[PDB]
């Protein structure tokens, strides 16, 4: 009957690549995820949470070319993302959906560790293109870590693991009543306790969305994650003639594969998280496909339900 | 016993006169506030609304000097600013009350109507300071309302009155289970029907956040509207040896005296539509004396229960 779903967007459904960060552009897309994510609503409770590469960048961008106030920092201008995009979300799926069904776009703040070791290895480039003379100025002004960009630098930020969502009483309590509910927006707002482990503060950081929506998932007692992507499958032999998609494999085959690694690594490693940590499913496939991966009839199903692996 | 309290957070309790728009400046004013408001959550059940006018005016700000990208329109704006200082009020009050306490932070749309008189006459000053020259450009390829600005001129926008806010349902079902709930941030998002009433669309305005937390007040059935304002009532004869701060007055006295006109008219009179809406009390008054404003002891006090002024 009734399932406890976490639908987690992919960057690329709310904005694609070639196409400037417009409101107007992203409405389009959110649309038509929402046409897509509404299908598998009626019977169900529905988590849906995203990423926010490009509105958190746009954000950075423009705070960095104002000269006459100092910026926000990365925390905060995560916060303003899930404002942005859930708002968007909230109202083309309401469109959508018989008005009784209640909405709530909860901003989400999750708990980092100070300890861990993406704090001495920034990876995601964020801001303007500096030449040599303004990164070089800007690191010795404000700490910053950058990574070189061609002949020229882009700051970097720490990518830690998520350690616990603050809000999932919330959720669950709105979820409970039929609420269809959006948050932990691009990954969550880092957040991290000072060394007494009394004061929480955000942090300049950044959190993959796939690692924290199988984190939700988990602390949400969801019946399946869906990863939702740009492809409708992982698949073996990619471009050959036994190329096959992967219907469904648990986490011991697909790492031995090697699908922890390439460009598929994050959410093949959320999903097999998922898997793990709670014997139920993370499917990795398309929103037009979302009511076949309900069924379980498309989607990359990662599963320790069942060892070894199944084609389609 | 236990009640059902409203707190509308003015601006100036986010942001004083004379400071720059930062993270840092923002901060240890919201610090200030959730001290004073954590001392009326234990045993109550507390919703906490806020303004947004120096946040919102920075993103106009910001996004209008960034050429390279079409800057998002300020509905949108609005959703970004309730991210932004929702995240810092559940972060500040969080750290203040026992983590058992639950927070949430809500994205709150608000419907408008489409023939509020505000639409054709818009007020409320947002973006840069232009010439006459580029006003007049601006003007001719967007439609805005422009007002004199010193020899300059600067966009004005609509203001309407709130008409209904979306998540109601939400928010009631948070507060049954204990949360404190932060919510019509800024007013709320401003949103408004096609000529049909089936679609949703934001709109280009703002809304007074007075006006939106008597509303929010009313569908909520707060027993207590709380209007935090920098001063600790309204006064008659101020400035004069007669000058007497008023500790109770029916609508009908207020209206009769002037205090529906004048520097505190919004907040009277919003006051005043909570009063007569519910029976029950809105009190104008400082977070300072919170604690005393719940007892009945402080801040001036509208209601319809007794007829006439009384004061202290």
Same mark, same amino acid.
């Given at each position: 009957?009734?399932?406890?779903?976490?639908?987690?967007?992919?960057?690329?459904?709310?904005?694609?690549?070639?196409?400037?960060?417009?409101?107007?552009?992203?409405?389009?897309?959110?649309?038509?995820?929402?046409?897509?994510?509404?299908?598998?609503?009626?019977?169900?409770?529905?988590?849906?949470?995203?990423?926010?590469?490009?509105?958190?960048?746009?954000?950075?961008?423009?705070?960095?070319?104002?000269?006459?106030?100092?910026?926000?920092?990365?925390?905060?201008?995560?916060?303003?993302?899930?404002?942005?995009?859930?708002?968007?979300?909230?109202?083309?799926?309401?469109?959508?959906?018989?008005?009784?069904?209640?909405?709530?776009?909860?901003?989400?703040?999750?708990?980092?560790?100070?300890?861990?070791?993406?704090?001495?290895? *920034? $990876?995601?480039?964020?801001?303007?293109?500096?030449?040599?003379? #303004?990164? /070089? &100025? @800007?690191?010795?002004?404000? +700490?910053?870590?950058?990574?070189?960009?061609?002949?020229?630098?882009?700051?970097?930020?720490?990518?830690?693991?998520?350690?616990?969502?603050?809000?999932?009483?919330?959720?669950?309590?709105?979820?409970?009543?039929?609420?269809?509910?959006?948050?932990?927006?691009?990954?969550?707002?880092?957040?991290?306790?000072?060394?007494?482990?009394?004061?929480?503060?955000?942090?300049?950081?950044?959190?993959?969305?796939?690692?924290?929506?199988?984190?939700?998932?988990?602390?949400?007692?969801?019946?399946?994650?869906?990863?939702?992507?740009?492809?409708?499958?992982?698949?073996?032999?990619?471009?050959? *003639? $036994?190329?096959?998609?992967?219907?469904?494999?648990?986490?011991? #085959?697909? /790492? &031995? @594969?090697?699908?922890?690694? +390439?460009?598929?690594?994050?959410?093949?490693?959320?999903?097999?998280?998922?898997?793990?940590?709670?014997?139920?499913?993370?499917?990795?496939?398309?929103?037009?496909?979302?009511?076949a991966i309900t069924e379980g009839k498309a989607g990359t199903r990662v599963s320790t339900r069942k060892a070894g692996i199944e084609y389609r």
């Amino acid at each position: 009957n009734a399932m406890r779903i976490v639908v987690a967007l992919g960057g690329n459904a709310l904005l694609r690549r070639g196409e400037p960060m417009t409101a107007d552009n992203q409405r389009e897309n959110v649309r038509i995820a929402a046409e897509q994510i509404a299908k598998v609503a009626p019977g169900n409770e529905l988590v849906i949470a995203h990423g926010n590469g490009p509105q958190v960048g746009l954000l950075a961008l423009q705070g960095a070319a104002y000269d006459k106030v100092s910026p926000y920092p990365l925390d905060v201008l995560g916060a303003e993302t899930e404002g942005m995009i859930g708002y968007m979300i909230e109202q083309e799926m309401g469109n959508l959906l018989p008005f009784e069904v209640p909405f709530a776009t909860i901003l989400t703040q999750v708990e980092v560790d100070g300890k861990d070791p993406a704090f001495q290895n *920034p $990876t995601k480039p964020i801001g303007p293109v500096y030449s040599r003379e #303004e990164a /070089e &100025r @800007l690191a010795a002004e404000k +700490g910053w870590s950058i990574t070189p960009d061609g002949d020229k630098f882009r700051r970097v930020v720490p990518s830690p693991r998520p350690k616990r969502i603050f809000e999932i009483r919330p959720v669950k309590w709105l979820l409970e009543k039929g609420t269809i509910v959006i948050c932990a927006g691009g990954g969550g707002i880092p957040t991290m306790y000072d060394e007494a482990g009394k004061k929480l503060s955000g942090v300049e950081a950044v959190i993959d969305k796939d690692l924290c929506s199988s984190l939700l998932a988990q602390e949400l007692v969801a019946d399946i994650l869906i990863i939702a992507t740009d492809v409708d499958a992982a698949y073996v032999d990619w471009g050959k *003639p $036994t190329q096959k998609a992967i219907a469904q494999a648990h986490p011991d #085959e697909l /790492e &031995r @594969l090697g699908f922890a690694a +390439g460009s598929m690594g994050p959410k093949v490693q959320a999903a097999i998280e998922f898997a793990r940590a709670t014997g139920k499913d993370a499917v990795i496939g398309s929103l037009a496909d979302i009511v076949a991966i309900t069924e379980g009839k498309a989607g990359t199903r990662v599963s320790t339900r069942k060892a070894g692996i199944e084609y389609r």
